[PDB]
């Protein structure tokens, strides 16, 4: 036995690293996509992060920390959702790692996620993240309307 399936996605986006990088670590922009999520962060290595929201009338809060912080290069952070209501098992969650690079034509992006129970879950995650990436591209590429 060993590590399970890992979800990975990537798309070619034409935009400056600053703005893309900013969109990744910003409680203000991250709020634009959300209806009214209050994200709080220090934006530095080892910084704790908490999200406020409401679920089925039951208020819940997530919790994680920055695994590593490399200015305009690499960003990694651990994440845990209490909505899981699963028995005490830290291995229940996974760590997300985002890789951003500035190329001559544009900037390449990649998002990876582990701990997938099955292909169905990996696909579900892959398709989900694709939606996020697609949603990000739709907003960023919005400048076309202007």
Domain ranges of the chain: 1-146
Method: NMR
DSSP per position, the chain: ----EEEEEEEEE-S-HHHHHHHHS-TTHHHHHSSS-EEE---STT-EEEEEEEETTEEEEEEEEEEEEETTTEEEEE-B-GGG---S-GGGS-EEEEEEEE-SS-EEEEEEEEEESSHHHHHHHHHHHHHHHHHHHHHHGGGGT-
Pick the CATH number of 1-146 from 3.40.50.2300, 3.20.20.210, 3.30.530.20, 3.30.160.70: 3.30.530.20
């Amino acid at each position: 036995m060993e590590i399970k399936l890992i979800a990975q996605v990537k798309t070619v986006i034409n935009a400056p690293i600053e703005k893309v990088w900013e969109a990744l670590v910003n409680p203000e922009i991250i709020k634009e996509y959300m209806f009214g999520t209050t994200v709080v962060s220090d934006w530095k290595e080892g910084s704790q992060i908490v999200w406020k929201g409401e679920w089925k009338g039951k208020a819940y809060e997530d919790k994680g920390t920055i695994l590593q912080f490399n200015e305009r290069s690499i960003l990694q952070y651990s994440h845990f959702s209490p909505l899981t209501g699963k028995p005490d098992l830290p291995e229940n969650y996974h760590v997300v790692t985002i890789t951003l690079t500035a190329l001559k034509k544009g900037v390449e992006v990649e998002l990876t996620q582990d701990n997938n129970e099955t292909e169905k879950e990996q696909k579900h995650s892959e398709d989900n993240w694709n939606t996020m990436l697609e949603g990000l591209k739709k907003f960023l590429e919005n400048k076309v309307s202007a």
